[PDB]
Amino acid sequence: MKTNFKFSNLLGTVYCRGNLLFSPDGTHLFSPVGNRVTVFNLVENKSYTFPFAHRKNISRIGLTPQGNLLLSIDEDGQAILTNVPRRVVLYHFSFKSPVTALAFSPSGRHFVVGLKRKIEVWHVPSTPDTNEDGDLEFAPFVRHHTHMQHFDDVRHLEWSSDSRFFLSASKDLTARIWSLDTEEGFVPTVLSGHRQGVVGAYFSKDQETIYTVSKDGAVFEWKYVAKPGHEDMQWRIVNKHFFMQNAATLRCAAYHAESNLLVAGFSNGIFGLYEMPDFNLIHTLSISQNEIDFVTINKSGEWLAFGASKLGQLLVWEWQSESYILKQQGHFDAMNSLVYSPDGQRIVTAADDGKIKVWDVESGFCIVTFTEHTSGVTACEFAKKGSVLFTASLDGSVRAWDLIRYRNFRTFTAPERLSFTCMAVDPSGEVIAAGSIDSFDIHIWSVQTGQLLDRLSGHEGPVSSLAFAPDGSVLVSGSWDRTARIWSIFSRTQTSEPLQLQSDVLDVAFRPDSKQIAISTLDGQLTFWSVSEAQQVSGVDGRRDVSGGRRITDRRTAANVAGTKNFNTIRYSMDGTCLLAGGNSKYICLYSTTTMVLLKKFTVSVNLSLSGTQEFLNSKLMTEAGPVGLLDDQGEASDLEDRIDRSLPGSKRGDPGARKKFPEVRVSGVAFSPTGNSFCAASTEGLLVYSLDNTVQFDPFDLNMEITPASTLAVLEKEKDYLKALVMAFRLNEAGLITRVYQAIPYTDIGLVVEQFPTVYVPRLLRFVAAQTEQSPHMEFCLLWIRALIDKHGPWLAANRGKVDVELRVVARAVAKMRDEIRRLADENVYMVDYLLNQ
Amino acid sequence: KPKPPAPTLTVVSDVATVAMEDAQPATAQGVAGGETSMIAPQEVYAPSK
Amino acid sequence: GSAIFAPYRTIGLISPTGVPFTSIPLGKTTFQITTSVGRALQTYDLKRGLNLVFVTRPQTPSDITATHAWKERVYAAFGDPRNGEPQGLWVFQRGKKVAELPLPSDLDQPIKQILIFGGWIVACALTRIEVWKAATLEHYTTIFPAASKKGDNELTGGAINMPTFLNKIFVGRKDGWVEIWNVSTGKLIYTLLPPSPDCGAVTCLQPTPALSLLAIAYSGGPLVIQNVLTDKTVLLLEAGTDDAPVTSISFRTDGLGAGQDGRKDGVMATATSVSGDVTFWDLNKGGRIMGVLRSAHNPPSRHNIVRGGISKIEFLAGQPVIVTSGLDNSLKTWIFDESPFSPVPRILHQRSGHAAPVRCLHFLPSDFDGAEGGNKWLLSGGKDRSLWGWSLRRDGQSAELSQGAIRKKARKMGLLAGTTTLEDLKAPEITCIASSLNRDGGMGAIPGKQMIWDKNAELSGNTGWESVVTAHKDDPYARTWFWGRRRAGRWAFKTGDGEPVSTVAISSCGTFALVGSTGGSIDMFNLQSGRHRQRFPSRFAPGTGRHTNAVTGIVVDPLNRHVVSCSLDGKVKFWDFITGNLVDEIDWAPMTKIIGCRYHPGNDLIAFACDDRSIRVVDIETKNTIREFWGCRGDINDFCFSPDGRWIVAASQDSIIRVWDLPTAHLIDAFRLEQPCTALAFSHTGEYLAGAMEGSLGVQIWTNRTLFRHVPTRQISESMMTLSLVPRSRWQTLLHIDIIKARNKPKEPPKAPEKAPFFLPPVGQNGISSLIPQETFTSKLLVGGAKGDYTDFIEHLKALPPAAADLELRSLSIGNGDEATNELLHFIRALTSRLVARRDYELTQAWMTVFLRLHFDLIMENEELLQALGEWREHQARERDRLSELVGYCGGVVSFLRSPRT
Amino acid sequence: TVQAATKLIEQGHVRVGVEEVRDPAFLVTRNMEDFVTWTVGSKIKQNIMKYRDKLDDF
Amino acid sequence: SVQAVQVFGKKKNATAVARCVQGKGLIKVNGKPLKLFAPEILRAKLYEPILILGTDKFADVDIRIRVAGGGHTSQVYAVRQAIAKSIVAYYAKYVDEHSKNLLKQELIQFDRSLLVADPRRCEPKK
RNA sequence: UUGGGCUCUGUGGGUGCUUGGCCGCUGGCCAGACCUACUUCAAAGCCACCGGGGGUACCUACCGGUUG
Secondary structure, X not given: OOOOOOOOOEEOOOOOOOOOEEOOOOOOEEEEEOOEEEEEEOOOOEEEEOOOOOOOOEEEEEXXXXXXXXXXXXXXXXXEEEEOOOOEEEEEEEOOOOEEEEEEOOOOOEEEEEEOOOEEEEEOOOOOOOOOOOXXXXXXXXXXXXXXXXXXXXXXXXXXXXXXXXXXXXXXXXXEEEEOOOOOOXXXXXXXXXXXXXEEEXXXXXXXXXXXXXXXXXXXXXXXXXXXXXXXXEEEEEEEEEOOOOOOOEEEEEEEOOOOEEEEEEOOOEXXXXXXXXXXXXXXXXXXXXXXXXXXXXXXXXXXEEEOOOOOOEEEEEOOOXXXXXXXXXXXXXXXXXXXXXXXXXXXXXXXXXXXXXXXOHHHOEEEEEOOOOOOOOOEEEOOOOOEEEEEOOOOOEEEXXXXXXXXXXXEOOOOOOOOOEEEEOOOOOEEEEEOOOOOOEEEEEOOOOOEEEEEOOOOOOEEEEEEOXXXXXXXEEEOOOEEEEEEOOOOOOOEEEEEOOOOEEEEEEOOOOOEXXXXXXXXXXXXXXXXXXXXXXXXXXOOOOOOOOOOOOOOOOOOOXXXXXXXXEEEOOOOOEEEEEOEOOEEEEEEOOOOOEEEEEEOOOOOOOOOOOOOOOOOOEEEOEEOOOOOOOOOOOOHHHHOOOOOOOOOOOOOOOOOOOOOOEOOEEEEOOOOOEEEEEEOOEEEEEEOOOOOOOOOOOOOOOOOHHHHHHHHHHHOOHHHHHHHHHHHOOHHHHHHHHHHOOOOOHHHHHHXXXXXXXXXXXXXXXXXXXXXXXXXXXXXXXXXXXXXXXXXXXXXOOOOHHHHXXXXXXXXXXXXXXXXXXXXXHHHHHHHHOO | OOOOXXXXXXXXXXXXXXXXXXXXXXXXXXXXXXXXXXXXXXXXXXXXX | OOOOEEEEEOOOOOOOOOOOOEEEEEOOOEEEEEEXXXXXXXXXXXXXXXXXXXXXXXXXXXXXXXXXXXXXXXXXXXXXXXOOOOOEEXXXXXXXXXXXXXXXXXXXXXXXXXXXXXXXXXXXXXXXXXXXXXXXXXXXXXXXXXXXXXXXXXXXXXXXXXXXXXOEEEEEOOOOOEEXXXXXXXXXXXXXXXXXXXXXXXXXXXXXXXXXXXXXXXXXXXXXXXXXXXXEEEEEEEOOOOOOOOOEEEEOOOOOOEOOOOXXXXXXXXXXXXXXXXXXXXXXXXXXXXXXXXXXXOOOOOOOOOOOOEEEEXXXXXXXXXXXXXXXXXXXXXXXXXXXXXXXXXXXXXXXXXXXXXXXXXXXXXXXXXXXXXXXXXXXXXXXXXXXXXXXXXXOOOEEOEOOOHHHHXXXXXXOOOOOOHHHHOOOOEEEEEEXXXXXXXXXXXXXXXXXXXXXXXXXXXXXXXXXXXXXXXXXXXXXXXXXXXXXXXXXXXXXXOOOEEEXXXXXXXXXXXXXXOOOOEEEEXXXXXXXXXXXOOOOOOOOOOOOOOEOOOEEOOOOOEEEEEXXXXXXXXXXXXXXXXXXXXXXXXXXXXXXXXXXXXXXXEEEEEOOOEEEEEEOOOOEEEEEEOOOOOOEEEEXXXXXXXXXXXXXXXXXXXXXXXXXXXXXXXXXXXXXXXXXXXXXXXXXXXXXXXXXXXXXXXXEHHHHOOOOOOOOOOOOOOOOOXXXXXXXXXXXXXXXXXXXXXXXXXXXXXXXXXXXXXXXXXXXXXXXXXXXXXXXXXXXXXXXXXXXXXXXXXXXOHHHHHHHHHOOOOOOOOOOOOHXXXXXXXXXXXXXXXXXXXXXXXXXXXXXXXXXXXXXXXXXXXXXXXXXXXXXXXXXXXXXXXXXXXXXXXXXXXXXXX | OHXXXXXXXXXXXXXXXXXXXXXXXXXOOOOOOOOOEEOOOOHHHHHHHHHOOOOOOO | OOOOEEEEEEOOOOEEEEEEEEOOOOEEEEOEEOOOOOOOOOHXXXXXXXXXXXXXXXXXXXXXXXXXXXXXXXXXXXXHHHHHHHHHHHHHHHOOHHHHHHHHHHHHHHOOOOOOOOOOOOOOOO
């Protein structure tokens, strides 16, 4: 197919070590993940992700209160700024320090930033968006003032409301007031008196009093009055009080000045909020067992945003309604596996932490959590209905959920207690195939009754990965006994055919045309077989085609290094012509199934917290104490809860201590999508959802020389030869033009043009009508289209049935959306109104 | 080896699938989504001796 | 100017002018070496390597003649007023202008040098010195030296300052004289003459570390150093020839380094500009010579294309480093050691660029989406025969590519002092390059060192082999290049014919590299092994597709299915690769003559530049021409597609760039350049465009203002039931708004105190939310119902948020029982109106269901609404019948198609 | 000797299951002692096959 | 230095060690040549890898082969196997790996046994 | 191609997107300068990781008392 997959959106991880933001419009939420920033539009449920990707993880996110501009800064101080409404990246710029503090003035003319001690204020750059005849400058920032009046970490800064003074809350129990420009009746001044360093300091609305809130939970209100001896006045404290949190510190502090109310989150994972100037406790509640890393507030002041670092645990809390706005939970140990749904709407993930969760593709959310398993959860799968889901997890239970009533309407377990590493289901929705790692036998249970059916056996080792051929004729096993094994079950003999390989198996796949199997073994090569005539027909040795390495404490050269040279998981294209294949590496590879050559190679992550994202480390990282990314930096922590190391000596797998500084990047799963056009990869960067990029690329199908957009419009308008115009439009293959003509033609000539249309073009046509039926609101018209289409070309469509497989599936989901979208309401309304009409 | 299966009971309600989900400003589910009761007609009633 | 690209940077250049560079010490540690690009100034730290510290914005409209560095600021005098160009003097600091200066109006002299001291700044133009008060930046006065001869009056040499004198500057004449000027009252106070007046013109002068002791350098050959208050000669040196005048000197200020034991002091360095060799004297006994750094820069030559000649030399103060720059785009730094005494220093930094204009340019393809993007490595093949991996990111990670120890092989030959030159010892000037980086494994590709250009596989096949092929000028070998090791590689193929290589392209898989001869042979090598896979043709009719003319413009279809060959004369032949045979030829022989091809992957697109000044684009999948562009008035110099396929860009010999929107087949952009562009290129992100001009060395780089801001230009030049745009989400939560509130309640309740603080402070916009937009929706509906057009109230109902919408709908009523008063009935009439208008069926049914759910009892209690209800019911019956019939029909037959065989 | 064993598994010739292992405290439970074996491209494994004379170059 | 590839092939009880190094081009068995070692009909089964591969491949290397164990036809299938896995391994280790993968495609697509001693053990119908 | 080669050993850039050196920083300094003044009022609480079983006279922590 058309294989040019630019990077569409991040997904499924939801908050990283970072700082939350609101659009000043008050609706959209900016939040950092890894090294990209996703936006959640809240009003319409939507999310996306920008096209940049820093190297190290995000550390600061500041906005231009106009709304259009964004500056995000990484650890070690690399910085990127983007224009938001046109999502492009503008500039790259290097602070010489690892940034900690950041705020833009509400006037939107300068910003202040707090590096490890130094304080800075730079201008804002004149954007090509903002000047009419404008250009990218070279040096886009100009540096206004620096300040070295200060003795420790500078941990928060905040502008005034008149954009003339700003407050600097330090880490050395001090705060300082600073002039934007040289005022007359003024001295830049200090404020001292706390007991453990201040986290926040802000102006009042009427900028006379200022608050500070200091780390042991002590809030001080200061006024600029005379000394107690009465020209002479002095910044002193009018009064003070303390949050009565018994047994922690607060880490996070914020406060709306317009509505005079303050919020503070503490290390025990409770937060509270207060009507400030009178100091009454509005209320308080515990969100999360770990702690709060960052709190920030609505521009209007209705909403509160909490980011909890150590988990996903974003939550946005409406306070005056005492209600959640959302409570999301990105995963917190890695993701063993995933699938799409035969809906195509949404994807389901299964982590090794214990929760499984259903993400929606649009709107970036885990719609549902289930936490019925007590252990790490490996593989996940779907029966062809797409309403039953099967998980298999280390606790020894295959749980079988229903997803339209949300309950585990079975569980399964082997007699002697086993631990399923791998599984799948028959596509019947009637039989479950599981494979352990303790006992090599491969069990099969009946769905419809649950009691065990058959322990298949034959295997000289544990059985490594399993799948049913999508028709349901064949179960396929691969085991580490060098061997792959065709189990034909539902035949009356339940026969077995061996297949000798070269080494251990790792992952299996089928073709939707159920004749072909693709098995990915341990040397790394793929071997491609035809099922019936069990003969190998193709093979690809892709070791150098996947090696990317050089982790921390990986003392082989990145080339030589063992164990990053095999595909942990392959998967087939929905059109049935291209493998996708990713695993313990840096790269995802994309292979041609027949020509056997490499289509494409993607890198999974540009990040540098992770280890294996660059195939050469560097000298000036290496110190005479080994690599610098091995120092147990735990001692320099301020919190005891951060000084402890409740680790375990030597557990690769699930160990709660979570030492988890500098981990690997394993492409633990990949999956295409049942509408084609897009796939995804489960990585420890979260989950990445790639799609094709059509609209950003002009692609002529089989063009001529006389077919311009204007030519199409002319023959559309003057000549009105609608069939000819349409076939030219598709031939040109551009979205806006095809949209235009499709909207233009009359809904009476529709039968004429479709009856005279060419069937080579007809599938691409079907797809386009699907996209229109979904997202454009001209529903009835699009339905007349799809009616005439199938009514004209039934037997050709039924004749092929497979060459259009994605087009079929997308039109079916489209009319399903319409179906469940409207006709339920229509019938329900007419029934109700008929009843009340009939009294 | 994990453990022998100890039997565990867990109660479900009469309220809907939206009550099962987590917290977010919209339900993803459709409009016929929401009026299903998370339990079955069997659960609310079956005739019996 | 351009309607698309803005000149973003003249990248690839460090010192192309004869301009004296400038260096201000800082700290106790750091130095700023600052030279002029030729349009803007640039500054370079010394301790942090030589990494580019500053560039200057905005550029000046002229060439920059003069620059100097003071406290932090840089003074830049630009402009040659004798020929048209306006001039001036600016002050930058951190690369942005902080000041301009008032100039004398009557200043028709280009301005040679600037000099800053006391509190005054000094401008030496051509014959006339202007001065400013630097404290207020004001023009103070203007000085004029006088002479009997229009020769003799010319201010050459220069004007410096005595270290400890008071407000005196020292000027030299075209005549051999030096004139001391008290600049305070603007008064010539002394004049000095040289011994043996056969010495003609003072060339350069500089104050020594000694007291009151100056070095004047005559064109006539003697240097001399003098007590500038006793006017007695202190040392005299026959130090230049009449052919080779000393033109810049610098003294070492260290304390040690003379007397053949390194311990004593008094070392000085002298430089010409007719050679590139610098010379070191030891002053001590009578001023003996001590050595020659032979050919620090490239030796200058008038017959040769290779630029040379040395601009200025500074011994930086206190330290034995000594910075040199020349003409040939090179800034090097040298240092003496100690414990071996060194007559001549060794090099301890260097930064270079080309010595000629950039002949070919080529962006490197994507490091897949990783750290590069596509836009980090711009590869430049340069007419001084080199090849440069340019960074665009960090302009100190740009590195020349080594051909092996070329400098050593020279210096063990004799090419340095005075049988060829260094650029002759390199590999010949580069015709066209082509690359891939599927398999260039970075540095440790083939461990151990591997031979160069010579004409084992477990280890390569683990890491990575050669990756950038290059065809040179007239050598029938085609070279390879490692890119991971920045170095030349080990394969250098012939042609098979023996004729000179014309072009070369490379696989997608990076394995194959096909060379294209001017005889017509088209050969294929497997790069990793240095071997010879397929000849074209091997051995329509097989064994015969042989190109008569030169073969220029091959490219691989990215599946390794077809190769596509472009003859010079005539035809394009698609070959079946794996066979090695002609599959399909297409012929434009009797009218055209194709010069080159550019290929777009992902869209199966080829573009051909052909000699009738035309560009023919053919979609290779369908083998028939799709476009032919007609814009050129000069011979096409270069041309390349933008990776969207939306533009194809070209610059002919007519010094004009044109850009066609490809799918619209139109002329979008066109502009004129000061020099015709000789090599364009396009980065793989659509962001940057690269170009190289003719005569200036170093490239221009443009950005894409179309990508950044919407540019509405398209100027071809010459010189039925719909729904509404509501978030379906928004009405979905409106439909279900009870239970979503129930679930968005937390399971645990918040811990309110006992004394709940009553009257929570006001929030949102005026006590209500921020999402309800601002201008009695009762008044809205009632006025629509007094009228007929409900549309204002209706679009307002669209304009509600869900909770406000639900609240508004629950707050409806009958009221007074009069017909015009009931929100309920008029709402029903509104919904009927929307239905017959056939506009918002979705929102209609939505509001219908919810309203019925929350008003059922009252509307059962009344009937005066129920008649309009029945009317609505009829319309609903018709519409739902038609629509549900359609949708159920369709979905069912689609199910039957997906699963027929039951 | 278990010293030299530490040296081997630090260079990384020693696989478990299907992964390589660097952490020299990977506590081998009794179900995994039967599996922990040599890695794919190992000069060690090829040395063994050299001594016992089956040295498959494929 | 002097290139060496040493390969195995196997069948029920034959064992076929074969060494493949640079040479003139001869092909030998125990110390006798190829067209002679056989039950004189099966020499096509011996020839098959050279005839799939084209001899212009084979004119680089020299192939000693030893054999023992088992009956004639066992030995014969062993020798064809060691021939093939030989020449593909030498292409793997001393010329371009792309020519390896193309050669492996030609071989495997003809038959599987020519690279893999896919043996016969016992598993009937249970 | 009018010496060749191995091996070792230094220096310099690179191996991550280019905004200066320093200081008491809205300024100055890079040759530095002035060097000790000024003061109304100590403090809010909690927690704060040593391997298991075991003894406990003395020390300690706590808890409850007793005289002075």
